Symmetry: C3
Subunit: 343 residues, 3 copies
């Protein structure tokens, strides 16, 4: 909610308390999942044409006791924007792939999980330099695109090191470039997006599966957003990029998400989503196994734009087996019951 | 301080910097205790009758250096409220027992410590579902009550596990129900409150004292709040619920706190409190020993509703002995010097 | 940006997103250095004369992934202020030495690093009680001064312990007193400042170099601030107070910083700084070596008071040798590219 607007700078301070509770046969995915977010979108007029902006967002768990209380920055970036030319923003942001793949990330809790956080240029991530251009230089009303770069983010110990290095390997990444082209018109929306990132010495030489020189992503996506209806699906194919449990990555992964939502006038918005992450010849005695697969059906009710509540039912179609145990991939169902104030 | 109020949504963003310093013979309870809090109470009108709300509050220590900086969520919950029916809010909140026992938690720093944080349904805690009803459905102007449930909050390792599980044992809890009934009229206030919680496998089978199937609490409380005067005391009896050092819990504990405060017009508010936590036949070669006992006298001065400063003198009546050493219970005095801005 | 001003209390909620990236031959000092700050300055009128205030400031790194996210309180203090008498504020604040030495801390990223954080009374630090007096009781328009005390801040383990104790040794400190006297007139500014702190048992008896009973600081400083020009330099001599790598402290250190900045009307503000930290007979087979030495030249461009961007070039004049390796002192160059929104 915009709490400052004066002399051309304006500041919107925003957040939510999500009273969330998971139900499951799985004890590790069962209990209070209450959390809270807090951020600000900032903005300043420099000229007619040029406008500068900042943006921050933190997440703080509220399911944890007075000792440990895990919490983290989600996005943090600053940048400029010139009329009919483009915009450029450096910091922790969304990777360019998300531009397309996010169109299926519309469920209230689950969904949009064929990618992880800090998973190369696939979703959230540190040190994205991002050019974007809306309406193609003000000529084609609808055609937006982006050209993104991500600096190497290696380890803390000597070999393959950066100042911000992380000792976790899945969070690591190398130098990558990615692109996106989206077009919207009368609700309908085509979307292509291609990334390609270098990999760290640690990533290949921890002895994990699905190793190579480069992690690469291809992404097609279609959506329809009109007349109370949101239909959208997407194809994302990856080489050595999709995470596979703790075992490593998938040499090749064929990922597909599809969602159908209708908004009733009184407040209810039921959904019926479906996900899939088929991992092709992974090697090391597994071969063509499914990394993820579930149907997801529930409904959000909207009291208004400040209060909401929802049920979300993950129907996990994965069978229990060695691949789904060695990797440690939850094969059980989960049901989330959310009740959320925001501002 | 309410920084947003518009079209029925309103947001109050609040906090304080407490410049605090402990003096003591105990080196562990001596030094800078400076800390800071920040939260928001949120609120939105949905209808004439229905109003929805959120609330958050963090605490961040300011006595610590640039490396470690410990800090945590205190309360984080969302919920609805319907006129003359009640209110329901899920998240980290106060346990229902606090409804009564908080009437003695009126001292500036010490006091209100016959309960801990995440100590079952006794004070702060994760995953409270809480029904409340003010003025008994708008019929009896004075009679308020509550019906509270708390989900199991076990460990992180396999046996007795939840998604939010903590490896600390005192912070753990099981499924519990609790109630409260308070009545106020012309200042005077009766208050009863009863909780009863299941216990974790770890809690019984870490070999600590005062173990059982259930932790249970009984609480009576009386207060008088008028004519510059605040008199209030309370009785809280517990089975296997009160913490006793690091040794475990007290099979039975008889807890009593009493406070007397007077507010002078210029700003000074002296107090004279007294606490007691008599632990009855605890077992394991201790028997009837005192878990806590101190007289507490100081005074808060109020410059105004934004600035305040105070002295707080803990006169610890506990003697030094095996029970008060094995358990590791501070037998020494403490004096706090607070100087506090807030907003 | 002041988001609350009402009935004499006013609250300014402020922060920035600094899109920062280090370039260097050093891998440890190379990568995304994106971070964010958030604080509030608070203030309340009590009387004509008396005014009470609070202040907080947190820093949260945005170069790190969803698991670890390091962040800390920078300053947190409350205090009162009476017209023509003085002001007194207890909490994590700046040490009194900074009063003078901060006049060289005017560069956009580097500079002001002959002192560390929690480095006795030299810069940031916990538990400063600070008296200050502006314009010498309203008599001499220009002469400001301060009298500061810092409580012992030892370790967490038994010997030399405080409630806030830190297991790091360089962050530790003992009881210290410090002073400052500054005088400004027509831009020109003389400044003297002297501190003297007790040391912890751990500090001497971890076997590190430059050990003694007391860490002491002497500080002279001169500045000129007018006609788009900022010229300022400073001398800081220390006994057993300046940190020297991981090896310990410098028995004696002769520190000097000098800066020259010009503000062009359109927005550019180039600078040309120079630093030096000559460590005299340190002992343990090193003798007179340089602890730090670099020339620093770049330029900040100011779009306006909300957006800015800059380049900052550390030209490290230190040679690579045993002292600069055993201590582990970066001998390499660094170049910072900042782009910063704030509010």
């Amino acid at each position: 909610a915009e709490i400052y607007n004066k002399d051309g700078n304006k500041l919107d301070l925003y957040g939510k308390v999500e009273g969330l509770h998971y139900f499951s046969d799985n004890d590790s995915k069962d209990g209070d999942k209450t959390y809270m977010r807090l951020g600000f979108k900032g903005e300043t007029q420099v000229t007619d044409q040029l406008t500068g902006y900042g943006q921050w967002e933190y997440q703080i768990q509220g399911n944890e006791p007075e000792s440990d209380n895990s919490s983290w920055t989600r996005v943090a970036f600053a940048g400029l924007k010139f009329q009919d030319v483009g915009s450029f923003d450096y910091g922790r942001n969304y990777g360019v792939v998300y531009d397309v793949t996010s169109w299926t990330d519309v469920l209230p809790e689950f969904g949009g999980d064929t990618y992880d956080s800090d998973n190369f240029m696939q979703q959230h991530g540190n040190g994205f330099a991002t050019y974007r251009n809306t309406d193609f230089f003000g000529l084609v009303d609808g055609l937006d695109f982006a050209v993104q770069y991500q600096g190497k983010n290696g380890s803390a110990h000597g070999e393959g090191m950066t100042t911000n290095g992380r000792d976790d390997v899945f969070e690591q990444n190398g130098d990558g470039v990615g692109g996106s082209i989206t077009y919207n018109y009368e609700g309908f929306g085509i979307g292509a997006a291609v990334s390609s990132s270098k990999r760290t010495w640690d990533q290949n030489n921890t002895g994990l599966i699905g190793t190579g020189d480069r992690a690469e992503t291809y992404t097609g996506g279609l959506k329809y957003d009109a007349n109370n209806i949101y239909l959208a699906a997407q194809y994302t194919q990856t080489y050595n990029a999709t995470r596979v449990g703790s075992l490593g990555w998938a040499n090749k992964a064929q990922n597909f998400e599809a969602v159908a939502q209708y908004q009733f006038d009184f407040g209810l918005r039921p959904f019926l989503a479906y996900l899939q992450s088929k991992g092709k010849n992974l090697g090391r005695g597994y071969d063509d196994e499914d990394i993820l697969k579930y149907v997801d059906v529930g409904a959000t009710y909207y009291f208004n734009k400040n209060m909401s509540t929802y049920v979300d039912y993950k129907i996990n179609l994965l069978d229990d087996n060695r691949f789904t145990r060695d990797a440690g991939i939850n094969t059980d169902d989960i049901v989330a019951l959310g009740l959320v104030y925001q501002f």
